[model samples]
Target: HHHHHHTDPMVSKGEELFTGVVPILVELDGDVNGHKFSVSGEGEGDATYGKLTLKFICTTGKLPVPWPTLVTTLVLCFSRYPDHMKQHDFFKSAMPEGYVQERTIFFKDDGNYKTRAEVKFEGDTLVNRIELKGIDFKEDGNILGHKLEYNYNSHNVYIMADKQKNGIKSNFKIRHNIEDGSVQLADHYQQNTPIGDGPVLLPDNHYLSTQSKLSKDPNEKRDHMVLLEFVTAAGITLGMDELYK
Candidate 1:
């Protein structure tokens, strides 16, 4: 008789609507590369994700609360606010009790699209919902990062996982390209506007905050226009200097 190693991985249910509000434990035959991924760190809470090893901070202390309530709180707090951010008081009122903030590990399982997850902070943990399908990259390629190419008129988008309240947002755009790796702006756009800031261009396979790249031809009167959009969309703009200042 032949034996196959068995492994049970953690998963989320009804993640599309609640955004990973509920976590469900199920049995599976194999693991990711045959390794256990858990929410809490070694020998911690439930053996979910892998080793169940999780490390995260919480906002409040000694307070009786469920995991969902805590997650909902952070979602509203860390998010941008107003225009791009979610509502404020609307979030506060939903909580069972006011809690202090602390760093904690919010666990998740990438379901390729929509899924659910769980969070662990100190002694308390919560299972929440997650909506990954809404991660629009192709329809609005402008949102996620895509490169411009002369031969490649077609476009594609990708979503590695669900949208997190606090994380990186990668977006890109593409236009005419040079036969070589060098980009010629004049070959594409009709004009050039100096939105100059810093490192204007992102080298292939590189990541930056506030930057752009302009390509122009010495003989042409125009430049190809391609917007970088930002990995952490306006991340450096609204997140870094401003928030700290």
Candidate 2:
């Protein structure tokens, strides 16, 4: 068999995952002489050689002008930072009579094996990267890469049933659903331990959805929300579509 990789080998877990896509919703800082704008970052391919795409959507106060006009103004702003013209050859382009002001660049992934579309123009509203599945990430040494969240930041965080919202740092790879809405512990390893009582902690970070149904625990302030943390994200994402079926 022909195999590649050592530390990070290419293995398949019957996953529809394609390195996931990092859709970064970009927001501009300061004012374009008083107009506002939002940008988005999208990627394709992988650490090999991928395309970084930027889409400029406009939001303004004075008047509802065309998108090209907004892009033109951004170009003029870029003209002020002439040094970036050569310093950052990653992205730059302008078009007239357009809907959205878009730009792109090509990059080869280094040891990082990730791309954080970090930019420094200037402004107030923070620009955060909404990390998606080309995007399931582990923190400890990372930064914001979300471009889809600029529209509505802090959406529901979808995690596995075996995992709880902000629970432990372990994943049994149990993404399937349970009937009574309770996940059974592993027959061997975790049989001694009940779910949500694990000694470790995961980066379980994200806003649980309002419609998400959680298991009821006597203690409202319990350590975990018990919507059967060990049991998962499918129910939350589907809002238990199969539970009814």
C-alpha lDDT values of all predictions: 0.21, 0.21
lDDT tens string, model 2, 12-121? Answer: 21011212332323543322222332433221211111222333433332222222111111211111111111111111111011012222211112011111222221
Instruction: Write the residue-wise lDDT of candidate 1 on 77-140 in tens digits.
Output: 1111122212111121222221222222211111111222222122122322222122222321
How far is 240's C-alpha from truth in model 2 (Å)? 56
In candidate 2, stretches whose alpha carbon ends up further than 4 angstroms from where it belongs are 1-4, 8-20, 33-36, 40-45, 61-245
Model 1 residue 73 CA deviation in Å: 15
Candidate 1 residue 97 Cα shift, in angstroms, is: 7.9
Error of 1 at 113 (Å): 5.2
RMSD of 2: 24.6
lDDT of 2: 0.21
